[PDB]
Structure formats: structure tokens, C-alpha cells
Amino acid sequence: NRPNRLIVDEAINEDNSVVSLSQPKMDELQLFRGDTVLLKGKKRREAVCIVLSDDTCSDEKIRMNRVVRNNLRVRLGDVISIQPCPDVKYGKRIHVLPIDDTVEGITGNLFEVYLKPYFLEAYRPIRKGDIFLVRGGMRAVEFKVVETDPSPYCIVAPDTVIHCEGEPIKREDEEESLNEVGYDDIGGCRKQLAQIKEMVELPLRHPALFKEIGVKPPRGILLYGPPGTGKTLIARAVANETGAFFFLINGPEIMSKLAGESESNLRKAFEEAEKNAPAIIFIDELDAIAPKREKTHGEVERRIVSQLLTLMDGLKQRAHVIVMAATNRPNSIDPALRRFGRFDREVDIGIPDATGRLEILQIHTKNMKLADDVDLEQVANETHGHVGADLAALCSEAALQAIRKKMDLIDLEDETIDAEVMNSLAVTMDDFRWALSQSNPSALRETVVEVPQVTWEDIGGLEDVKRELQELVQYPVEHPDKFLKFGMTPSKGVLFYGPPGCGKTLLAKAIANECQANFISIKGPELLTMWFGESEANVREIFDKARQAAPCVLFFDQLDSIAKARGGNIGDGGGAADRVINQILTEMDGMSTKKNVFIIGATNRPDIIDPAILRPGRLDQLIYIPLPDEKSRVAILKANLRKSPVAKDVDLEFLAKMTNGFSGADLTEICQRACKLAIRESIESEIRRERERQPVPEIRRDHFEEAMRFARRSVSDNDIRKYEMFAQTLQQSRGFGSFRFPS
């Protein structure tokens, strides 16, 4: 749309001094060949060059060297701008400093070998901070034009006095100037990034717009989210893009009990930041430093909140200073600090999803060498709840474990490690999976459990139940477009009920692995407390954790304990049980937007559960897990004995046929008993072999016969009759039968 817009492209033969541009864009820009122009770059870096006409250069692209990419901090395909340099004059004196690593090892004078031929009749425009690489000698040498006169744009001419000697340059400073953090190093928060960009970059870029509309940019930025999510990273990145001085503030370090030290600390910090008027203040852990003045007993904290209020009131002063605060919990901050003019705008930064965490992995591993085998999509999929900081830790641990794997490859005896053997060591996908297993998501460290180690193949039978659970967890998250098209929200509730040992907990643990969604398991009575209002507090905090980790599967094993018919027990904590039930009712279906939180309940006694718990909208689908039938019993036996080495002569079909009333637990008991009999036989055989010195490949059929002689039915007939009665009550509640539409 504009002639200035340009796409970065490589230069075949153009040096770092000049660039080649397409002739149609030359005429569109109304610029002559050899005109001194300026190119903009990221992090506010500019490169002055001589423009030229090239046929190979594309219309929408600018051909430019790699060192010019370093100078402008740009990469291939990026967007840059070109502007005519006005009132260009020849340089009278330029102070140019080679890098400190380049000077070492060069016997000859750097100016004569490199600077003099390059700058003899140069006519090459340069700007302060520009760096160019000169080929020649035993090693090519990099030169930085630190000073130019006239500043900041001048033309190099033979009359200009050029001397390499001077104050030594610093490699670390240039490396930092190259390795600064920008918006590109942030991923997965593009809507929050767009908000913050419109907040900060814009008023600096177009202040006349705000002046013409007569509004001032917001002087307060609050960032709230779980820790490690990048609240510090955005603040650090903004200062580089919009040239400023990042001034970090730690909440704990400012806080002091010296009776008035903390207020002086904040006031000094604000004064120091205002001194460097293009400044950004970052107040990390604002929640600790700023509680409610009335709520907190501590007078130091109420005074520090009041001082922060006073500083925020006078913060603007029509100055470039802006303040960004990070808090994990936003409600703990004093409501006065929530007002307009002080942190008036609050931005929520959430746990990254699959795409955002993939972007984080990409940007962290851009420097790391990546094999063709490794796919970071899979690494993002497996990290169901990892945070960006956790992702960075995972990336580092991966390479460290790769080094550990290649310890045996490196003999490390040589004084210098051989480069050819160096080449062999590289990262692998097994490395990523192992480091990922070792790495732990910090989002739900509180709810951490050992590996379920159960898959859908581990469960025999229940094919329809398996399909329904997979659809439940998968359709809303993988296909939200279809739910938007058909206009209705997904159902997010299932209650498993049935006799003990039939696979309800097994189904939940199978969900845990094969859903690619976070899983929180709540043992039934675990959430209750002896204190007056803390059981429902635990309920609402577990639901809050579920909402944060969406899509999450919230599983209540033995739900009949936490959920009862209200008023059933008068002495159950003086109505604390009923209050817990009411809290769960409000948390499942209340006046809050529904998240991707799927609540699964397992119970042996469904008739005692509160009817309000079981209505559609809370545990929508009531699924009965009955005693397996003969085919399902064959499936259970096959699932249990798939891992075991079992003889072919054994007939699992006959076992399933005879075990009429056996549950899955009973059949697993049969398999375990047969294996124990085999263990006894094999160990006794080994003892006999040892005795005769001084075997059994697969479990035989007679072992299973003895195990059956030790088999038993666990679930009584009265209990299963009760479960059938509950199911029949549901069916009678439906009414009628075989709903058929007329014509």
C-alpha cells in the first residue's frame, strides 16, 4: 500500500554499506539511484545506506545483507520502512572501533588492511552504532562506527580522518543490544499484546491524535494471572521496542518493618524512574505490597498502600513514565488502587493453550538446533498444562539430558574435544519426552497425582460408555465450530453409578490419559473441613482451579459422600454438609460463564444424591455401569491377561461363561490368583533346580482351575437388584416408551 513498506530479502553481491532496490519501487518512491536513504529496524535501530537499482530485486522486497540484518535486528521476510535522508553532508571525522575479539590475532594494522581500502573514496553514509564486516587478512574484521561527525548522519570521504585506535569496545554491550527481548519473544497472548501495544506504542507514535481527540493515554497498567505466565516478560519487552529504561521493582524487597522505610523506598523508586523520563516501572508481586488497608491489621501495609495511591495520583505529570504491575490474585489489591487513573486498566494473562505453548516452544528453541525427527506440535500436546516458564525449563532440561545421553560418546580424555565426534551429539524426540516427563506443570502442582497407567484398551467392554466419554471430552474442545453452527453449548456432566468393581474409577483414569485435557481428581470427603465456612471455600477453590485449567476434567470419586439429599443429616456439622451441597450447586450451574470444565461423578449409592445435583446442567448424563455380561467378561479377561504370558490352550470364553455374577474386580482377582499359583510353582521349581544342582513359560490351565476354585462373587444379588431398581426408576421417570413421531 505504501512505497516505504519493504520485505527483507538477501543481497547477492551488495555489501553492508549499500542496498539494491527494484526500479519500479524506485520510481514509486520518486528517488534517484545513489540517493542516501535510511532504513528503519526493530528495537529502534536505523541504517543509512545508498539505494541502487537491481532487476533481480522484487517489487515488494528490499535486497540487503546479513550484517545489515544484524544492524536493523531484522530477519528474512520482515517488514521495514525506507525514508529519504535529508540534508546529507560529508563527514569531517568518524571514530570507528573494531570489535575486541577481531583485533586479537591480527599482526597488521587494522586501519590499513581493512578501514583504509573500504573508506578510500567511500561515499558511504554511516550512522552511530552501525557495524560493517570487512573481508581480508587471516580473519574478516567487524568495525563499529561509534562516532560520526556531523552527527548522526554523514558521508565518508577521503578527507575524513579515520583511526582505529581508541577506547576499547565492549563485546557484551553489542551482544546485549542484539539479544534484547521484544514482542517477538512473546507468544500466545496476542490479544493482550495488542491491547498493551495500543496502550504504550501508540501514544508515543501518534500523540497528535490523542491531542486532537482530547484524551490522554491510560497511566495505569495491571497484569494479573498465574505465576510464570510472562507478566515480567511483556514489561521487559516493551522497553526495548519503545526505547526506555526498564526499572524493575520487587514487592518483597520494598516491604520493610522499619516503620516507614517501605514508603520511602517506593517514593525513591518513583523519583528515580521519573528522572529517566522515558521509563517503565514494573511492580512484581503487587498483591503482597498492596493489600486492603482496612482488611489488613498491619499499619505498615496500609501506609504503603496510601503512599502508592499518592504516587499514582501524581504519576502522570505529562511524563513518559508508565507503570505496570503484576499480581497473581487481583482482589487482594486495595479497591482504591482499582480506581481510574491508577491501574485503571487490568489485563488477564492466562495459562497458554496448545497453540500458544507451541509458539513459546518455537521461540525458545529457535536458537537450539532442531532435528527433522522432532515435532514441537507433539511436545505442545503432551504438555497439557505447562506454563511458558515451565516450557523454557523443559527446553533447557532437554538439551542437558541430551548431553547426559552423549556422556558415553565423549571420551573427554583429549585436551581439546574432537569436532567430528562433537558433531554426533544432537537433540532427539526421546529426549523431549523424557525431559517432559521429568518437567512438571506449575499450573496445578497442588493437584498432582501418580500416573494412571490406564488406557482405553485396559478396559474390557463398555464400548458405548467409552464412546460417550470420548465424545464428551473431545467434541467441545476439538470441534467448537460445529457447536457454534448448531447453536447450542455442549453438555459437561456425567455420573457413573453401579456396583463396586465394574470400572467407574477405571473409566475416569482412562479419561485422565487419553483426553489431552487437564485432570483433577477429588477424593470424596477430602474437601471438607471442621471450620465454619472453609469446606465450601475448598469447593470453590477446586472449581476455580478447574476453571483456570480449562479444558479440565473434574472427577469426584465417591460423590455420594460430598453430595447428599439436603436435610438428610441434622448433625452433619450443623448444616455444613448442606452448605457444601449449595456451594457445589452454585459452582456447577450458577451465574458464571460455562468453561470447558467437564465434571464426572462416581457413586455406588445414587438414590441418596441430591436431586438438584443430578438435573441436566449439572451431571447431565447418568450412566449405569452394570455387571459385565459374557462378552464383556471375555473382554475384561483379555484386557487383564494381555500383558501376561498365557497359554493358548486356556479358554477365556468358558471362564466368562461360568462367571455369571462376577465383576471386573472378581475376574482380575481370578487372574491374579492364577498368576500367584504360577509364581509358587515357578519359585518351587527354581528351588528344586538349585537343590539338584548342589522354567514355566506360560500360565497353565490347571493354575486357572485352582484359581477358579478360589474364586468368588463380590457383589450380592440384593445390591444389583437395587441398582436395577434405580435404573428402572429413571426409565419410569421418562414415561411412556419408544418415542415415535407421528408421520
Q: What is the DSSP letter of 560?
A: H
Residue 547 contact, options ligand ADP, Mg ion, its own copies, none, Cβ 5-8 Å cut-off depending on partner type: none
In the list 4, 53, 81, 256, the residue contacting its own copies (rule: CB under 8 A) is 256
Of the pair 460, 551, the CB lying nearest ligand ATP is at: 460
Examine residue 272 and tell whether it contacts its own copies (CB under 8 A).
no
CB of 262 within 8 A of CB of 300? Answer: yes
Shortest spacing between CB 640 and ligand ATP, in angstroms: 6
Q: SS in 3 state form for 261-298?
A: HHHHHHHHHHHHHHHCCCEEEEEECHHHHCCCCCCCCC
Q: What is the dihedral of CA 491, 495, 496, 499, to 10 degrees?
A: -160
Cα angle, residue 479 at apex, residues 625 and 468 outer, rounded to 5°: 10
Q: Could you please report the per-residue DSSP string of 622-639?
A: EEE-----HHHHHHHHHH
Q: How far apart are CA 541 and CA 385, in angstroms?
A: 18
According to CB under 6 A, which residues from 460 to 479 bind ligand ATP? 460-462
CB of 506 within 8 A of CB of 495? Answer: no
Examine residue 602 and tell whether it contacts ligand ATP (CB under 6 A).
yes
Query: Per-residue x/- mask for Mg ion, residues 498 to 517, rule CB under 5 A?
Result: -------x------------
Shortest spacing between CB 625 and ligand ATP, in angstroms: 6
Examine residue 420 and tell whether it contacts its own copies (CB under 8 A).
no
Q: Could you please report the per-residue DSSP string of 647-677?
A: -SS--HHHHHHH-TT--HHHHHHHHHHHHHH
Examine residue 623 and tell whether it contacts ligand ATP (CB under 6 A).
no
Q: Could you please report the per-residue DSSP string of 316-370?
A: -TT-S-EEEEEES-STTS-GGGGSTTSS-EEEE-PPP-HHHHHHHHHHHHSSS--
- Is residue 257 helix, strand or coil? coil
Nearest Cα to Cα of residue 397 among 442, 427, 366, 423: 427
Residue 485 CB: number of other CB atoms within 10 A? 9
Examine residue 65 and tell whether it contacts Mg ion (CB under 5 A).
no
Does the annotation list 447 as a binding residue? no
Q: How far apart are CA 158 and CA 270, in angstroms?
A: 50
Q: Give the bridge partners for 167, in sequence order.
A: none
Of the pair 189, 308, the CB lying nearest ligand ADP is at: 189
Residue 233 contact, options Mg ion, ligand ADP, ligand ATP, none, Cβ 5-8 Å cut-off depending on partner type: ligand ADP
Does the annotation list 233 as a binding residue? yes
Q: How far apart are CA 117 and CA 110, in angstroms?
A: 11
According to CB under 6 A, which residues from 483 to 502 bind ligand ATP? 500-502
Does the annotation list 545 as a binding residue? no
Examine residue 665 and tell whether it contacts ligand ATP (CB under 6 A).
yes
Query: Per-residue x/- mask for ligand ATP, residues 636 to 655, rule CB under 6 A?
Result: x--x----------------
Of the pair 197, 316, the CB lying nearest its own copies is at: 316
Of the pair 351, 506, the CB lying nearest ligand ATP is at: 506
Of the pair 98, 460, the CB lying nearest Mg ion is at: 460
Residue 563 CB: number of other CB atoms within 10 A? 27
- In order of 284, 376, 614, the CA distances from 623 in angstroms are 48, 38, 11
Nearest Cα to Cα of residue 43 among 201, 189, 171: 201
Does the annotation list 231 as a binding residue? yes
Shortest spacing between CB 507 and ligand ATP, in angstroms: 7
Nearest Cα to Cα of residue 495 among 611, 662, 635: 611
434's grid cell? 523424557
Nearest Cα to Cα of residue 664 among 709, 610, 626: 626
Examine residue 627 and tell whether it contacts ligand ATP (CB under 6 A).
no
Residue 717 contact, options Mg ion, ligand ATP, its own copies, none, Cβ 5-8 Å cut-off depending on partner type: none
Residue 318 contact, options Mg ion, its own copies, ligand ADP, none, Cβ 5-8 Å cut-off depending on partner type: its own copies
Contact stretch for its own copies (CB under 8 A) within 4-12, 172-180, 227-235, 326-334:
172-180
Residue 212 contact, options ligand ADP, its own copies, Mg ion, none, Cβ 5-8 Å cut-off depending on partner type: none
Nearest Cα to Cα of residue 35 among 21, 55, 16, 14: 21
Examine residue 321 and tell whether it contacts ligand ATP (CB under 6 A).
no
CB of 110 within 8 A of CB of 164? Answer: yes
Of the pair 370, 720, the CB lying nearest ligand ADP is at: 370
Which positions touch ligand ADP (CB under 6 A)?
A: 185-189, 227-233, 326, 360, 363, 388-389, 392
Query: Per-residue x/- mask for ligand ATP, residues 523 to 562, rule CB under 6 A?
Result: ----------------------------------------
Shortest spacing between CB 350 and ligand ADP, in angstroms: 10
Does the annotation list 506 as a binding residue? yes
Nearest Cα to Cα of residue 524 among 569, 496, 498, 563: 563
Q: Known binding site for ATP: residues?
A: 227-233, 328, 364, 501-506
Site of interaction with its own copies (CB under 8 A):
172, 175-176, 250, 252-253, 255-256, 258, 261, 288, 293-294, 299, 302, 305-306, 316, 318
Site of interaction with ligand ATP (CB under 6 A):
459-462, 500-506, 602, 604, 628, 636, 639, 664-665, 668
Q: Known binding site: residues?
A: 227-233, 328, 364, 501-506
